[PDB]
């Protein structure tokens, strides 16, 4: 018996093999780099175990078959999809995007069948239970009828009770589905997301031993935020006229003082590798901690609830 | 499940033949040897661009091919068509057997014009006993788009006969000559298969085939001049192709019908000096050493003299049946002879199957 | 689902032909033969600018040559328009065959005028089998704006056929002489095909076409000049053209049309030697070989000398027939002979049938 | 490396005040802190959600 890794494991290296592949290293490189820049032993450790089948000549899709506690079956067979019809690099790519929409539904649902699925009935059917059974305390409460009744009638009384059940239903689905004129001021521009995801690329291509203008050309074709692409596009403009890489970030409001200080230092130092490396997993931090999500649930869960036993009382 | 299995030529396109070798006993000591041999014209529309396209009429053939044969085998090696099959080599790094198999589906996907939808199987040119980890890697692939093999596979079902190994003639006609090659080890030798739908060429040095190299022309090409210069049928043109170019009466003849050949001869002849100037890579200042014939389109009279003064190598028609015990009360030694270059393969495959 | 299928000649525009060649027994020996021919002038409004345009009519006209031919056979393969056909080579990187296909409709994007909307059928000018993932893909594609294979697909629906294969004319007609290209193989051969649609160019070494290019002019425009300078008919100054350009008695007919025709036979030429020299890329020191023709517009008369004087190549006609086997007592060989350059793709497609 | 290039460059002021700030910016956002949150959080609920079973 084995475990697979975490949600936030996966997602870090499927975008780095995903940033790397598309850039056009060769795919044992690209191994080599991310168990090279790695946190975790177990996965450094892995990779290095891909990377070894990689140059024995196996495909990815095989040599991740070496791993299936980790990479399952649906997870292999997307990267042979990709490497059959020659599109590895944009089935990594999607995969990379599938990760990190798994990591972030993960988080979102937990915070404050799988655990999310249990989890998720768990919560949903709650409080309407609490009411049935408070309502199931015998007879004559607040709002109900005597059993002599006729049912229809009964129940038809109740249906006050029956709504206000649903409506706590559907406040807890709406938390769990949501919840995991100057025209240009309307375009959604770069986030949080987007400014750790191009650190960690960088900071990936960069610690692998590309220059700086490569990674950037690359990075500029993998950018999902069209606003961030149209600014990547410059930044490079900008270094490959000879400007220096922290000027060109200067003009551009994502990357705050710190940040371009930083980048500054980098460049005096021979040490941008590691530089985007430290800023990138700061901002993956700040990404996972960034907690309302979990807070606003609460508001709505025991906001129903109380909502429902004032219903019928009154 | 071990028995001895059999052998047809079921890529003949012009004859589907049939060979049994098994072990032989004779005064307590036993060896390979021929046990029966049996030939049949193949029935055309069985076969169409390499596939079996009459499983049912292939099928009853190869059935006359067993009962004229007297075997009680039901087992079967054989072969598919070169115009099947792509053979070619291909470079990589060696590793765990999983990701070399997958790594060379990789690789031949770029080498395939089909889908996968493909055969695929693989063997290394130099003993993988020789080198190190992510080193040295050299594999040939054989791919097969699919249905050539479930045609083949149709009629060895409803013949009664289960394949064991679906091999190509490429280097099952060498086979029978593997010894004869392994003794001499640094020799470059060729052996050319002229075949009456394709003409196999693969040269070796010792049996190790350095590569192969598949061309469309062929005996049917012979045949069907003769038949445009004469508005002939297509059998009485290949009548007079054998019997017309050989005999001994002849003498009036080969103005006739090599004046209708002769475009053929040359271009043949500038096919095989294409592919040999094609392989000459690495040794700019050699030149070659001896080389040997199979099929029948190589029986065309005076053909061996015409490749041997054109290609500038000693090229020679060669006995398979050596490899095996014959048993001079059962067989002509001179017939067996006389069919060796159809039966090359036959054999081939054959000496594969009790292997 | 096997039979042999059926070819006519869909597109030409002045006239539809159809061959049916399947397998003929003889002697116990079987081969590709020649079974039954039919030939009508196109009913114009049928086709306009290589779209079917009155899919009924066409139909009625199929079902006619099929009677006349009295084939049972029901299957078919046709051609598009060379007018509603792009082709047109293209550099890739090849890998998997979805990936293929994804990023060859992806760069023909770029090459087609119209939405897609739009037929994409690829073919590699170099075996697959020849080269190392990512590296060294050529295709050629084959586009086609949609409905001239529907009209197409009407036209055989109800004609009571069925469609296998779609093919295009300028390869369609090598088919016959792709054997006598394949025996010599690093020869250079231009083949033409005058229609009266088109008159498309293909050049090869050996049966591996290097490149095609298809030019408006064709016969259409010899008859229709005859047209102008003589205020007659289609009909009649098609029959001038034939007749009047090729008689014995034709001694004081040739400068009353010769002086019509001038013109087109001196643009002709242009455009030819246009072509010719826009391919002459690599080989800047090197000349021609030898070619050939095909189509009626072809068979001007001395149009085979002028052409071989003016371009600086040997055109020669070729008899497509000989690829097939040929009873003599059901078709002359000189008949078929006269009528072998119309009906060159005509048997083209038709060898492309029981393929 | 980075007080390593400060070292040959007369410039360690710079790299210690961009370094320090650095670390007071990681300081005040400061993974270990949530995790052993909800291990209490679920762990207290399912030994109560026990204890009575029991
Ligand atoms: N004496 C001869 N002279 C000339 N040609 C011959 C002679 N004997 C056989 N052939 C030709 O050889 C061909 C048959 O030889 P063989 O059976 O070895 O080829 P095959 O293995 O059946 O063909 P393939 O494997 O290419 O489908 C026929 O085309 C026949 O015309
Ligand atoms: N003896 C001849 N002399 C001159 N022209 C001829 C002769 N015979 C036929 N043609 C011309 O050839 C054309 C028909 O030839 P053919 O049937 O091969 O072309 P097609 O294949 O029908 O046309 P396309 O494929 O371009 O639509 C007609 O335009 C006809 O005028
Ligand atoms: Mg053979
Ligand atoms: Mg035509």
Redesign the interface.
């Known amino acids: 018996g084995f475990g697979g890794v975490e949600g936030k494991d996966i997602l870090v290296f499927t975008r780095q093999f995903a940033t790397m592949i598309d850039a056009g290293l060769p795919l044992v490189q690209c191994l080599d780099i991310l168990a090279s820049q790695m946190d975790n032993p177990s996965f450094k450790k892995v990779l290095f175990a891909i990377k070894?089948?990689?140059?024995?000549?196996?495909?990815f899709?095989?040599?991740l078959?070496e791993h299936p506690k980790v990479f399952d079956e649906l997870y292999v067979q997307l990267c042979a999809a990709?490497?059959?019809?020659?599109?590895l690099d944009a089935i990594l790519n999607r995969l990379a995007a599938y990760r990190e929409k798994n990591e972030k539904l993960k988080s979102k649902v937990?915070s404050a069948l799988v655990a999310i699925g249990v989890t998720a009935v768990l919560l949903l059917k709650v409080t309407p239970v609490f009411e049935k059974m408070f309502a199931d305390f015998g007879s004559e409460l607040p709002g109900p009828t005597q059993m002599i009744v006729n049912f229809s009638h009964m129940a038809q009384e109740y249906f006050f009770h029956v709504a206000g059940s649903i409506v706590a239903v559907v406040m807890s689905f709406t938390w769990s589905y949501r919840q995991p004129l100057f025209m240009p001021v309307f375009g959604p521009v770069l986030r949080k997301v987007a400014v750790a995801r191009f650190t960690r690329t960088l900071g990936t291509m960069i610690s692998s031993g590309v220059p700086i203008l490569d990674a950037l050309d690359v990075t500029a074709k993998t950018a999902g935020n069209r606003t961030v692409e149209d600014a990547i596009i410059y930044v490079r403009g900008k270094i490959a006229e000879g400007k220096n890489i922290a000027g060109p970030l200067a003009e551009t409001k994502v990357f705050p003082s710190?940040v371009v200080?930083?980048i500054g230092?980098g460049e005096?130092?021979?040490?941008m590798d590691?530089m985007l490396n430290?800023i990138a997993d700061?901002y993956d931090?700040?990404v996972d901690?960034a907690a309302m999500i979990e807070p606003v649930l609460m508001v709505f869960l025991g906001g129903v609830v109380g909502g429902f036993l004032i219903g019928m009382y009154l | 499940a071990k028995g001895k299995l059999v052998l047809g030529l079921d890529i003949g396109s012009t004859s589907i033949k049939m060979i049994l070798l098994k072990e032989q006993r004779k005064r307590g000591e036993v060896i390979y040897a021929l046990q029966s041999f049996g030939m049949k014209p193949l029935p055309p529309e069985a076969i169409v661009d390499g596939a079996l396209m009459n499983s049912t009429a292939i099928v009853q053939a190869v059935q006359d091919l067993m009962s004229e044969l007297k075997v009680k085998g039901k087992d079967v090696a054989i072969g598919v068509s070169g115009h099947s099959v792509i053979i070619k080599k291909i470079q990589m790094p060696r590793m765990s057997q999983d990701e070399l198999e997958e790594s060379i589906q990789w690789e031949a996907e770029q080498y395939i014009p089909f889908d996968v939808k493909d055969v695929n199987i693989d063997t290394q040119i130099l003993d993988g006993g020789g080198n190190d980890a992510t080193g040295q890697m050299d594999v040939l692939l054989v791919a097969a788009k699919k249905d050539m093999i479930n045609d083949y596979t149709t009629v060895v079902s409803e013949a009664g006969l289960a394949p064991v190994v679906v091999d190509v003639d490429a280097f099952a006609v060498q086979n029978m000559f593997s010894v004869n090659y392994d003794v001499p080890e640094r020799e470059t030798v060729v052996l050319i298969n002229a075949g009456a739908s394709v003409v196999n060429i693969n040269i070796i040095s010792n049996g190790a085939t350095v590569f192969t190299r598949d061309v469309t022309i062929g005996g049917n090409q012979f045949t069907e001049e003769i038949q445009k210069q004469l508005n002939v049928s297509y059998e009485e043109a290949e009548a007079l192709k054998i019997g017309g170019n050989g005999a001994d009466a002849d003498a009036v003849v080969p103005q006739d019908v090599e004046r209708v050949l002769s475009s053929v001869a040359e271009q043949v002849a500038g096919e095989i000096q294409r592919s040999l100037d094609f392989y000459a890579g690495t040794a700019a200042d050699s030149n070659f050493s001896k080389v040997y014939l199979s099929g029948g389109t190589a029986k065309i009279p005076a053909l061996f003299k015409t490749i041997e003064a054109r290609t500038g190598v000693p090229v020679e028609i060669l006995n398979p049946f050596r490899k095996i015990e014959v048993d001079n009360r059962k067989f002509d030694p001179a017939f067996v002879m006389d069919v060796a270059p159809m039966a090359a393969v036959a054999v081939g495959l054959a000496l594969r199957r009790p292997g």
């Open positions: 070894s089948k990689v140059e024995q000549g196996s495909t899709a095989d040599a078959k990709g490497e059959v019809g020659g599109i937990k710190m200080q930083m230092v005096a130092t021979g040490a590691t430290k700061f931090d700040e901690a």
